[PDB]
Amino acid sequence: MNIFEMLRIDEGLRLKIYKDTEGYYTIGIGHLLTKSPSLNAAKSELDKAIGRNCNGVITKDEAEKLFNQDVDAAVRGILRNAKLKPVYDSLDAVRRCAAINMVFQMGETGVAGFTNSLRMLQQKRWDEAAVNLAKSRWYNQTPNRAKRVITTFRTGTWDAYKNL
Numbered sequence: 166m167n168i169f170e171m172l173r174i175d176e177g178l179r180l181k182i183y184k185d186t187e188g189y190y191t192i193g194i195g196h197l198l199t200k201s202p203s204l205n206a207a208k209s210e211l212d213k214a215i216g217r218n219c220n221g222v223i224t225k226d227e228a229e230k231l232f233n234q235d236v237d238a239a240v241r242g243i244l245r246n247a248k249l250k251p252v253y254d255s256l257d258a259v260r261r262c263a264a265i266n267m268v269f270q271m272g273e274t275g276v277a278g279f280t281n282s283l284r285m286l287q288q289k290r291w292d293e294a295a296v297n298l299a300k301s302r303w304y305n306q307t308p309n310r311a312k313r314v315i316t317t318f319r320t321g322t323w324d325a326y327k328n329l
């Protein structure tokens with residue numbers, strides 16, 4: 166398992182514009198197009214992202230290219246964030262994947278309220294961190310995915326992803 170396989174499981178793959186769990190236009194492997202309610206706005210964003218007139222549909226290769234870009238952006242975002250970088254650097258490889266997964270899903274503003282969880286992760290208090298992480302809108306709105314990510318933080322293993 167690696168971060169690409171993990172997020173591919175969590176986000177799926179859809180080649181036509183769809184609405185994500187929050188109702189936002191998205192495509193590919195969880196590539197957010199816009200938070201605007203306008204499908205036309207989403208189609209514009211898609212054409213801009215892909216560099217051709219897509220009419221709301223992309224190829225698998227195009228989806229995988231956006232995915233590579235998005236994963237890279239997520240990781241670089243962590244390394245540029247003064248709050249996140251030290252915790253990330255303190256983690257092992259498997260737990261780093263859990264970190265990237267969360268930032269991929271919610272961005273850095275979205276993890277802003279996780280100060281206490283970050284502290285527990287940095288301290289390697291894994292059970293405590295796991296309990297704290299579940300006290301979140303994140304957990305309540307996407308519990309199956311959050312449980313997988315939390316299990317990954319708790320154990321430092323891929324046990325939650327092994328049965329897909």
Ligand SMILES: CCCCc1ccccc1
Binds near residue numbers: 249253267276282
């Ligand atoms: C739980 C805080 C958001 C995810 C995260 C955890 C550790 C390091 C970077 C990012």
